[PDB]
Design a protein around this nucleic acid. Sequence first.
DNA 1: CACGTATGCTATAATGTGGCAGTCTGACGCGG
DNA 2: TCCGCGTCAGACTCGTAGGATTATAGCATACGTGA
Lengths: 50, 277, 1340, 251
Amino acid sequence: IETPITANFREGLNVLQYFISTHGARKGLADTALKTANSGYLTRRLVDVA
Amino acid sequence: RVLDATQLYLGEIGYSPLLTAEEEVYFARRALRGDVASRRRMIESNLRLVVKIARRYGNRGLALLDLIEEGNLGLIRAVEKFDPERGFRFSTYATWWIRQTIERAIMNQTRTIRLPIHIVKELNVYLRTARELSHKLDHEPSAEEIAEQLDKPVDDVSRMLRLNERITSVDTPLGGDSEKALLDILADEKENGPEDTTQDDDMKQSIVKWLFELNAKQREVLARRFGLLGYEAATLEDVGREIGLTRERVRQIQVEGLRRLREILQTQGLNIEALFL
Amino acid sequence: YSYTEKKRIRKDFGKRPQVLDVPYLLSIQLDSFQKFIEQDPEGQYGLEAAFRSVFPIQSYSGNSELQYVSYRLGEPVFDVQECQIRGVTYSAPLRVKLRLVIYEREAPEGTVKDIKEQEVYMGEIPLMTDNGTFVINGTERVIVSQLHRSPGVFFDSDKGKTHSSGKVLYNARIIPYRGSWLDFEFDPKDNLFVRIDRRRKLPATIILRALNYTTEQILDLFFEKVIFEIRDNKLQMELVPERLRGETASFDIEANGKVYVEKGRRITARHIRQLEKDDVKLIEVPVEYIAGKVVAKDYIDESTGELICAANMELSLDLLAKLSQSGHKRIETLFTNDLDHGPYISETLRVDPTNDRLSALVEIYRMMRPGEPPTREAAESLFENLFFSEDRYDLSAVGRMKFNRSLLREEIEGSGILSKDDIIDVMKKLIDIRNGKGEVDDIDHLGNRRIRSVGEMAENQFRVGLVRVERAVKERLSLGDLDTLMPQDMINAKPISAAVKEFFGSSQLSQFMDQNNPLSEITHKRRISALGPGGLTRERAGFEVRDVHPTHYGRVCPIETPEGPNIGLINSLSVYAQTNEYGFLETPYRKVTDGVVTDEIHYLSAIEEGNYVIAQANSNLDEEGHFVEDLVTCRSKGESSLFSRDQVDYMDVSTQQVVSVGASLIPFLEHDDANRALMGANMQRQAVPTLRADKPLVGTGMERAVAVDSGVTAVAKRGGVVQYVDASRIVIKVNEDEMYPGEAGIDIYNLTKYTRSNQNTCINQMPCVSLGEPVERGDVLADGPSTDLGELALGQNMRVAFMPWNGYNFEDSILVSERVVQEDRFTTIHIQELACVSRDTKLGPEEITADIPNVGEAALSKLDESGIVYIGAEVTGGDILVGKVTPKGETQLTPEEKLLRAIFGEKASDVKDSSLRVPNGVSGTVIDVQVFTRDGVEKDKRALEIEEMQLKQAKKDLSEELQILEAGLFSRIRAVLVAGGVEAEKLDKLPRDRWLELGLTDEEKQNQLEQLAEQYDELKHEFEKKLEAKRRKITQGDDLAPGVLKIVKVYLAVKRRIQPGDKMAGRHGNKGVISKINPIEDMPYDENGTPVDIVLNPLGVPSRMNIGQILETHLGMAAKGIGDKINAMLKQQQEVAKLREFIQRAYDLGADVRQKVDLSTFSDEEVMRLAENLRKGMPIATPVFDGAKEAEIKELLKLGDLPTSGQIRLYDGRTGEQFERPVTVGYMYMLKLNHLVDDKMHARSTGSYSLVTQQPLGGKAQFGGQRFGEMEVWALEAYGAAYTLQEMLTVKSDDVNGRTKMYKNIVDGNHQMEPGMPESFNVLLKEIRSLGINIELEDE
Amino acid sequence: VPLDGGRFATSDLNDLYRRVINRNNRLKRLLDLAAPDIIVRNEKRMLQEAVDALLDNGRRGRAITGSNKRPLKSLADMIKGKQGRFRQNLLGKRVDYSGRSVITVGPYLRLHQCGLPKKMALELFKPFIYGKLELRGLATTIKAAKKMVEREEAVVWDILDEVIREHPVLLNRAPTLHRLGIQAFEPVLIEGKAIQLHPLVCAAYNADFDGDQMAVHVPLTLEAQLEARALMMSTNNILSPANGEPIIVPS
DNA sequence: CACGTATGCTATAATGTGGCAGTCTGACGCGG
DNA sequence: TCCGCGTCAGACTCGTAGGATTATAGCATACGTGA
Ligand SMILES: Nc1nc2c(ncn2[C@@H]2O[C@H](COP(=O)(O)OP(=O)(O)OP(=O)(O)O)[C@@H](O)[C@H]2O)c(=O)[nH]1
Ligand SMILES: [Mg+2]
């Protein structure tokens, strides 16, 4: 995003800074739930071949 | 290329001729008189009728294809028992046989646990009666409400509706999540745990030690009556077959063995302790 | 302020005046279902729509037909209460008037033959409760609204489908509400194709041939014209200047007498404007330029009458010569350009194998029904029944509307069937997008995502039921006699009733209401789900849809969604957001005219919002003038920047509207990371109601709204004085001004007492009014389970210190004072339900006798004569609740048992032991018992005692109704008789039974006596028939499942106190498990001697970035500081004046406090009741982004004489010495989550085993073994622990011989391993041989 | 098998076998009756369809569906995939002498110890308590031993205390990514239902006490006990097998 | 015989079938 | 040989709760076991 968050957490975010934060956050969390399957499948393949 | 079983079959039946009255009579005269060709041409010509009456009895038990085959079997009985000399048309006569055979087949194969025609038809009149009752009683009908309408026993109605209880698949997963199903919950009740199995070992082995502890004639007469050490479970009067040969002295010696063993369970620490069990 | 607010005012640190109040939170559920049952006369809605859609239907023969008149819902035979106790669905019978009309075949349409009209019952539909739930089989269930792709049109394109070429292929998709999908798409060679329901691909022009379009007409549709005049000898061309653009001039371009461009010269802007202004129309051109231009229409030689050139055919020098000599000196060719106007349809006609309309219909028919011989009848029927039949195709109003707006039409509403115009227009727009004018939409945009509430889904299933029955009806109408056959003999209820019960039951969106918390309920009903029928799958869901969309602003919460696989798809609705009439989400905004910000509010849909520029709510207003600062922060086109003040079109209504309800309850949310806040709002929902409803000191303000709107609190319908308070009920006498002139005007609210929740929590209503108190309409009369004086109370605030402690707060682990356990404040109530079923078996009926083989008198002490435990009886694991005995068949008694039973005699009785006993380790008090007996089975003595209770209790309830209603009614007649002939004490002397004979003069007041007299008698007979109904229902023998003779339900109440392993959290997503309960002596204490309740680890803050918890702690301390100061002044008893001074100065602290609260209006007594409540701690509100600032909190701390740091000197309870530095101490509002260690602790040595695999079962409820999975196996493989592994594969699992032998070895001390083969392996082999693969073991 | 409520529940194979038998026997009938060939053919197609459905349902075309819509589980499906015999019941199993509970800190514990709930340990070591009860002569028989432990008699706690001494137990946390996801400890009996974990091995388990749970496993045999004490004990397994680095590090 | 279970016959003419699926994805072979 | 259609995979433990639907005429003759 072209406009960054000028504020900090002690200062407190406004509606738009917080809304902008959300995207990255939720992408991160969704990555945890969904991508660990492919990582684990790699573990599984490795274990099976060795 | 069409590989649909249905489409291929319907294609083949399509290219076989519809008959008129005179033609049906000519063929059928020779068919009764034994003309392999005549019967086949009448069958093959009238397959299209079978399919038309096979598309009405759907979503009930078997698939369209299944009904199409049973329907065909009904049409064949119709060709075998057709009367050409009677002015009455073939299609009219065949309709009866095809509907009949299809209905009868959907009454024996439609249910995993085979229900006899009698039970099924009984149940059906209970059902149609329930529908008329619900049409005027707004709310669905009770067992007794149906029973009151037919002037019959409530237990009759109850047993029939119990039979209607339709099966659950063991493999059907529970909680929408395709995870664990009925099989993943359902125990083997018959197969006891090692806890119960080992309890019986301890029980049987404690009786061995008790048998080597009571008197020689008391554990002889006691064990062979109950069939513990003997081979067959005899009675007070039947212990006479061995060497006892007694009716009263078998009953005195049976109970004498039991009274000394009741004191053996009061001292070891059971009696009232193992009375709850 | 209101009367309930006079008792306790929350101090507000908000600064933005709230222009719009929080709407009813449970709007969606109630409006939608209201529209489903709402019988609309013209504009069909819900049921009405369903009937008009399917009906009227006719027979296959066409002679007989069924037409629909009208429907009615019967009133429910059992009310919500009786349904919940009995376990039946709360529903109304659907009775429908239907007219069987028959036509004569001899007359043309002889409608006057047989008309049979009557009212048919077909199914009961579940009714929605007052609070937007349904009661299904005695359990409250909520249907979650759905979010799906809107019907209409959609332009999309895989950005580089073939990764080798990387060429963008554009596609169109027409999505109807019901019918086949119609897809248009480009290929790499730029050929337009059409596919139906993604079937095999067809040239796009083939569909136009099915609509009867000749080649000439198709070109006339998609292409423009280039005209060629052939004059004298030279060729001439009709020119449009702005065609020859970005091109190379291939020949010498000249007109009348001026040469513009030479051969091989680039035609720029300048040349074009030159040519246009010169007014050039015709230009002479070379004949060789034509080779390659495509002719548009047909041309024939008028002389021969044969084709010179067919349409869409490339022109040559020879064709042109022959055309000239025939007599055609004008030639329409296609306008076509590689770049701007792409020749797509032209190339697609060359790929089109079809010629005429029939050829096209055949090819379409052959696609969808491949191989099957085509007929013309079949082809026409199939194509018309695809997108041109009322029956099988319907865009709906939403679909036609979105379709027309996407095609830039003017007309919103129209036909649900596709017209020829529609299809062509879509193809045209797809082609425009390929050309480069226009853009593709995106699916995540809320302008393309529609919300489908309950009523629409109920409507859909109800249509399906009608369609299934319609099949049966047409089939029976065909063979049916016309005269004997009644309409209701053809209709079946089973299919409709089955479709609807299958929706409210089998459906993913219909689930057990999450009711462990008022907030849990209210958030659950405001849930949106992208899943379930007609939706996406967890497996099928990418990441695009999941992530926060710019359109989500003010409509959907960015901060509320499960951190599971359901992460993107489940979402809570924003606060002020609402459902558009067509189903799109919309948000309120304040209209700004000429910079002046009007109080007129406008709800903008996702699509409308993009078009205006919206200022943020944080903009400083110039006191109803305009924006103070000349630059204002605004957003439009989904992106944010600075704007001038007069440029601003709109502004955010509230600071809160971006967030959902759950998140709005988080104070200082502004200082919390969105991730932690998500977890916080999700865990607040899992907060179990404690025994004592404790208000939160540090609130937001939404607390009141949530508590009241959830409806778990009893609120006053009408204001007045409370006539009678009770634990069980509340009677309020209404004021004269609100009180209707008909009835007595006394409202009676019966309060719901200790009842079971779906999470086995305890639902109890406590009265919060005093006897004889004046009450305003819409005040809280009684608090629900987690509410305090009308505010939401989900847990309990307490004294917290952030500091490490001996590792007992290691990773979020929590150290709690014994004081908290002792005060029983975190203690919770769980109501569990145990049932005992007496079934009829093959051997005979099971009995509910207390007579059970092998039971101690100790056990039978608590069972009555019937064999049911007494009410009030405390029970613990293994105690019998309901005695039950089952007939046992023959069993081969082992020779040992033959011997043993011969020793003891004690012949084991024919009856076994199936008694319901207390689950092991649960212990509680029996608070209630319910007995269901079949109609005809001899009732238990206990069932009879319970019926005595219900009957006499019922009689008392109805008696008190008629008594309070008669007293209230005559109290009015007494006042009416005074207006006219006042004899107050003289009229009351002789009896009140002989009163209504006394009249007045013939006035309106004489007519008032007549009204009160008619209603008194109305109530008199009404009381008779009500009591008869009650008595019938109490006598009514219950219809249970087949096989089941009677069922006994015991309700236990268990008191669970907090202990190590219980899960606790704040509202900032700060989790923890209790590690240790410390003695109060050991707890860190301050200089004053007051010990902390909880010690939390500060190492769980900087990493987490949830600083909300710290601000909450500082402010919570400040709140409690003011509370301690008021508490000190009340202990001293200074006087009303002094308390008033301190309290006014306190409420009006903040720099720009919005809420003013003047104590001069408050009477002295009102002040005392307020201070009395504020002594526990002064309640403060921090609105979400409009919260308290650090400055305000330090100022509040100074009013408390507490430090600015909010850190205090603390002393170690053990040593007495001080800690090395100040510790942050204050009040954090904390929650005990549903995750009790009591529910999670499990252990098993030996138990039941699975049926086929023979391995132990799963789950603690089935006494399950832990799964030792592949991953767990590998761990033992890494270690090299071979016997441990084998053990877990064999003696521990399947190996049947092994497990018993091993058990016996363990009891004999010898830990010997005696393994064999797992039975699962044996099964594997059998399964493989059942496949017909020979798999044998070759032995040694 | 019959459910309690008089209901029946059956495998899908039985529905599929019924299909095959009905069509096959109908084919025998049509052959006895000398039926015309097109009918014979349709029955042979039907037989192939039903056999194909029985062996591997969703392989050739549309899998044959139940009334639920869901495709019937065929033979091949019981060997095939995660739900199949290999992955689910054979390379990984449900296991006896296994428990699970919430975990919480035990800072007082030494590296080789773990807090084990009394009620949990009483049930996991059931047969060892019965065997010791018969050696003390406290229990006359196994039924008496069982009832003595149900009553939770004071002498039973003293016996339980005796058995768990020097007996290692396995703690496991999901997910088990490396071998240290399972470690052995000497158990320490505690009143209270949560497991107490040693802080320093929180690293290997990736365990944080925000409501994490763990599984408990009892090594039964002398061999299994020694495997646990020697190979799997937490004191014995400090260094990561991945890098030569100590995994047990203060945090 | 009865009770439970089964097979059987009926005659206006009637003669080719048709409720969901929602589109997932990056990879690796296999006929035209 | 390349496009296109097909087949194959897609982390580990815990949890919750039970459960759905339809309908097959009416009557005469035939076959096998207990009283
Ligand atoms: N297997 C699995 N683990 C999860 C899931 N969600 C969270 N976790 C784990 O639970 C833990 C929660 O966060 P923490 O472990 O506290 O994170 P951390 O590595 O300490 O990092 P900081 O919080 O920044 O100090 C992480 O280790 C995650 O790996 C999930 O869906 N599956
Ligand atoms: Mg954790």
